[PDB]
Design a protein around this ligand. Sequence first.
Ligand SMILES: *[C@@H]1O[C@H](CO)[C@@H](O[C@@H]2O[C@H](CO)[C@@H](O[C@@H]3O[C@H](CO)[C@@H](O)[C@H](O)[C@@H]3O)[C@H](O)[C@H]2NC(C)=O)[C@H](O)[C@H]1NC(C)=O
Ligand SMILES: *[C@@H]1O[C@H](CO)[C@@H](O)[C@H](O)[C@H]1NC(C)=O
Ligand SMILES: *[C@@H]1O[C@H](CO)[C@@H](O)[C@H](O)[C@H]1NC(C)=O
Ligand SMILES: *[C@@H]1O[C@H](CO)[C@@H](O)[C@H](O)[C@H]1NC(C)=O
Ligand SMILES: [Ca+2]
Ligand SMILES: [Ca+2]
Ligand SMILES: [Ca+2]
Ligand SMILES: [Ca+2]
Ligand SMILES: [Ca+2]
Ligand SMILES: [Ca+2]
Ligand SMILES: [Ca+2]
Ligand SMILES: [Ca+2]
Lengths: 271, 276, 48, 48, 49
Amino acid sequence: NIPITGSMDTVYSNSTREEVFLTSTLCLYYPTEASTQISDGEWKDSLSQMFLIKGWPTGSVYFKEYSNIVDFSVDPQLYCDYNLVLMKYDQSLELDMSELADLILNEWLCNPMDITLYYYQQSGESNKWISMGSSCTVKVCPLNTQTLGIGCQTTNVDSFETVAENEKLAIVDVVDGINHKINLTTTTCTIRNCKKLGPRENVAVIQVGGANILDITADPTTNPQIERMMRVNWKRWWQVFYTIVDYINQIVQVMSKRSRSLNSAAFYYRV
Amino acid sequence: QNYGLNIPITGSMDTVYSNSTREEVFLTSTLCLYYPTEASTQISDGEWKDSLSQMFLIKGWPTGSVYFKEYSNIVDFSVDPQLYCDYNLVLMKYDQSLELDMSELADLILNEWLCNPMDITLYYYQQSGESNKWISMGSSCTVKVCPLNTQTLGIGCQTTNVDSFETVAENEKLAIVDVVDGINHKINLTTTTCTIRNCKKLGPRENVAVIQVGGANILDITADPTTNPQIERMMRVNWKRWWQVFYTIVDYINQIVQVMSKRSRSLNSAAFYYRV
Amino acid sequence: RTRTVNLYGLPAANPNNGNEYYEISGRFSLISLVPTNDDYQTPIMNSV
Amino acid sequence: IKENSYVYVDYWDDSKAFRNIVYVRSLAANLNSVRCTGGSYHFSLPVG
Amino acid sequence: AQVDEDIIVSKTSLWKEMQYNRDIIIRFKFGNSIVKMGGLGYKWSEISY
Ligand SMILES: *[C@@H]1O[C@H](CO)[C@@H](O[C@@H]2O[C@H](CO)[C@@H](O[C@@H]3O[C@H](CO)[C@@H](O)[C@H](O)[C@@H]3O)[C@H](O)[C@H]2NC(C)=O)[C@H](O)[C@H]1NC(C)=O
Ligand SMILES: *[C@@H]1O[C@H](CO)[C@@H](O)[C@H](O)[C@H]1NC(C)=O
Ligand SMILES: *[C@@H]1O[C@H](CO)[C@@H](O)[C@H](O)[C@H]1NC(C)=O
Ligand SMILES: *[C@@H]1O[C@H](CO)[C@@H](O)[C@H](O)[C@H]1NC(C)=O
Ligand SMILES: [Ca+2]
Ligand SMILES: [Ca+2]
Ligand SMILES: [Ca+2]
Ligand SMILES: [Ca+2]
Ligand SMILES: [Ca+2]
Ligand SMILES: [Ca+2]
Ligand SMILES: [Ca+2]
Ligand SMILES: [Ca+2]
């Protein structure tokens, strides 16, 4: 990063809202029960026409339905330029909802893990292991300096310490600085060693249900309410979508253009 | 004489000082986890305290420092909560209908209290001010109060017929009752199964910390309705697996004790000073 | 068709029970002096 | 074979870990348990 | 740390000191020696390991 000098007297520039609405795309990820309750199917076209009033051209809005939160957690591709994630809260899904929110909101640099050969440590605070799949049950057996289990026997998977069971997505943090042996169902689930970089400006999460419960920061001490974790009450999905459409300017104002020299190619819905 | 309270300590804002008052009467600081019995039930192991001690040794705590203590459930732990130990963490498994009892145990342990007895059957008691409560602890406390007029005649309750009394806490291990400040009160509870104490609240016990394991943020230690502070020591986590919770605590233990401060600690293990 | 009954253990008559083997997964750790370069061979193959 | 007794299993491989193994320290291992069930053996009497 | 790591802990001109950790599969098999007594043929002398 080179320095960029700037005066403190230059006049504020005009509003760039129209430029960004003409140049960018918005995409909404909502659960299937939304469409089920709406009981329609001209509704995507109607909402596109409705967005056109707020100033998003006809092709700018992309509605990507997903089955439900736990099933969408498994490797979410956010094919867009401004991402909204409607997220219906149900009791006992708190941790999984938080996991998904952390995953998409935060920028991660992930490396493959070969569970069958190497025992993996965690470098520090920012490192986690993310396991995604149809059913991930990661079991961890910590190891000594001589590679012998403590609280576990390295060859008896039954004595291992389970930290996730049958979960589509698990973000495990273990004690940093200790080698571990992992048992995860290699045919089903894929585990990656990831480091949390800064935040992802592209995505916003609209919790639809209950109290302020999302905790992106795995640290117990800090529980910061980030601006992109919006929340709203609901009884009717039509009311939720009308709320979003009416207040779309505020939402995209909260979000901001993504900035990262990525290396993994993937499909994007850009103009 | 004193520790030099009544004379001021001066310091410079433009100098970084060097020499420190090294003092220690200890083996070393001792981290100290209170966990519900359901945690060990789900873990279904038993070299696990050894495992966690080995983990803490990596994180920098010698062997004989960390202690693990089981309590049945939060309501039963509330009765006379003893913190026999230096750096206390309490894991409270949140669940519905225990909001008040959890918030109340948090209010009891996080804050310092100065308690006098209450010969309940003889006198009538008041509450001096905002910091004064009546803390009743026992196997089953059932506090029934009756306010009194200036003439010592009950209002809304005949002072003789106990059935007319106003019940303020019904069959609870711990009840921190606040009543109207300036009204004489006649109190009735089950003297054998419960002990009620007139407790003032000093500053906050900045030693014990509370990790809420379950969901939403409900801990309101401040009995006032207007204020709902969120102290640094009201930590919280989202949980499915107690092993994950304990690994989280171990991994981030340094930050937790950075939030805490061990300088506040009493000789006795009691959660409240007793001043007869 | 015998009198000796209800006595525990394992007899030598057929401990294999038609199993080609008894398999135990396992791992070990050890530290050992060996010559500096691995091009050496201690005698292992024998005539008795 | 009962509780008071023991079963020894000696093990060796053609790998580098045993190339010149003559001195060893800090030896330890973790082996999951196993079960051995005895099969049937027919005592072939001349008659009966 | 690998499953089959080959770690050093001390090296000298002639000798070194390797730490070996390996995952193994111990396949073993019991042995028995049935020795049937002489006589009419109804007696067995020992059923040993
Ligand atoms: C972590 O633990 C699980 C739990 O055991 C491991 O599953 C095991 O996977 C192996 C290989 O897929 C299975 O081996 C099978 O053995 C049977 C006979 O024992 C044989 O018929 C098959 O062809 C195959 O070789 C093993 O049964 C299976 N264990 C269980 C209880 O089903 C898993 O492999 C571990 N993770 C890693 C990375 O090894
Ligand atoms: C910015 O806004 C002012 C006031 O509305 C307008 O006069 C000006 O033309 C705008 N800038 C541009 C580049 O159009
Ligand atoms: C050492 O500590 C004392 C406080 O007892 C302070 O007055 C003094 O300035 C300190 N030393 C230096 C070099 O600042
Ligand atoms: C509480 O009321 C009951 C019912 O009249 C009475 O028996 C009991 O003595 C009262 N408690 C005290 C401490 O007087
Ligand atoms: Ca175990
Ligand atoms: Ca999960
Ligand atoms: Ca970690
Ligand atoms: Ca947190
Ligand atoms: Ca209570
Ligand atoms: Ca009454
Ligand atoms: Ca009061
Ligand atoms: Ca309050």
